[PDB]
Amino acid sequence: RKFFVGGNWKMNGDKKSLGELIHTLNGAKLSADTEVVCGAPSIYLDFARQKLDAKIGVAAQNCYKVPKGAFTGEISPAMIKDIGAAWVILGHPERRHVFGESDELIGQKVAHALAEGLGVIACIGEKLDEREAGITEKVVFEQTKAIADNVKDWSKVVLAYEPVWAIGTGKTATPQQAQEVHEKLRGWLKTHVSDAVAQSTRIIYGGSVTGGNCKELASQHDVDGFLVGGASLKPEFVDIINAKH
């Protein structure tokens, strides 16, 4: 399983500062063993695909569930593919809890994006109240069931565990907390899909991953990489990419 780190740039940047960040990534020594994708805001998807070295992937931060139609403010897998991006992030906790996207809806978005030929970074995660109530395993199995049910070919899906209490707060999952649910997810996938899907699907972690804590998280056996938020806007994103080296 090739190490995967995506940078989720969320609602950040302008053309000046993202051209500056992209020039850093392009000219930096980045490990050939790491798959790297940047999630630009939709308004700069085209410009990021035009400026980033081809070996770096571009992902869209959200997309809708049909190719075209009367849905003011949305964009589809067809437009993302037209601009030359190869990925879409779906199910992100901000889309679930701030904008109300349900499992049903993430689910049809996953199925439509895959049928259109994109890759899907599918995000699952429990809230703090659910972890303190002890039900982390039920919540996250329910969420990857809703995804897996819509997955035909797993070669294009990367699962991203992003516990909500760790997104943007500074309160990273410890390497043992991350490890435990990542091997439970791997277990879920072996019991419910197959052993072969379980062994090759990257499960990545997200939630306050920095240059200073990444190396200990990547040493864990079932952590296949990261989906980095705030630190992907920074010079230390190169160090996170290079966490196994």
Added chain:
Amino acid sequence: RKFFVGGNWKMNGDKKSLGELIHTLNGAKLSADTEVVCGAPSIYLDFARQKLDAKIGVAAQNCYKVPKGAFTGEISPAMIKDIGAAWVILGHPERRHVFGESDELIGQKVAHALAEGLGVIACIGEKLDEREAGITEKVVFEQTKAIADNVKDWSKVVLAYEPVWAIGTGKTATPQQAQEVHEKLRGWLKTHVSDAVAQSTRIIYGGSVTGGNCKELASQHDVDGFLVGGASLKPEFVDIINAKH
């Protein structure tokens, strides 16, 4: 009061077909007395502003309420200005009824977009079961109030009445129907805001405007233009632009 034709492409297009369309608009003999804007997918806004003639406005179909942050999937007024687009469409019916945007959110996004110096095409419109219950006027005044309370400067606001029973249905309002609620809107404005605002503010109609029914609606006294959807993807858009012709 300058006649205003907005083109809302909704979630349609790709670079080849919007490229065909934009080339027609740049070539067309468009009226000197109309202000035109095109409302392009977020993913094609930079492309649409690069390629469209400078006299034609570009509008974003949605945005959020703060300038930057941890809101995966959103774009901000700062990013839209950065690209050169001068307007945003806020509170479109599809956003309210398919995507749950309440009047409190639309009201906070209007104030933010205006604080950032963009123009806003603020949308309002009743449902058919509300028209038949005899409460159009209380609905659209409720909606307009949620916007007006968040507007410190009206020179950059265009209001768009869009009865939801008329959007993409083909069931367009008669000129008499558009005119009754637009003169009601104007009067609401002169009594709850001011005479100079009411005199000044463009109130435009959308909901199945075609080149076939546009001269009759445009001859109505308080209809200052249109926000057209499906027909703005066709050569027909040029007729609607020129519609007092």
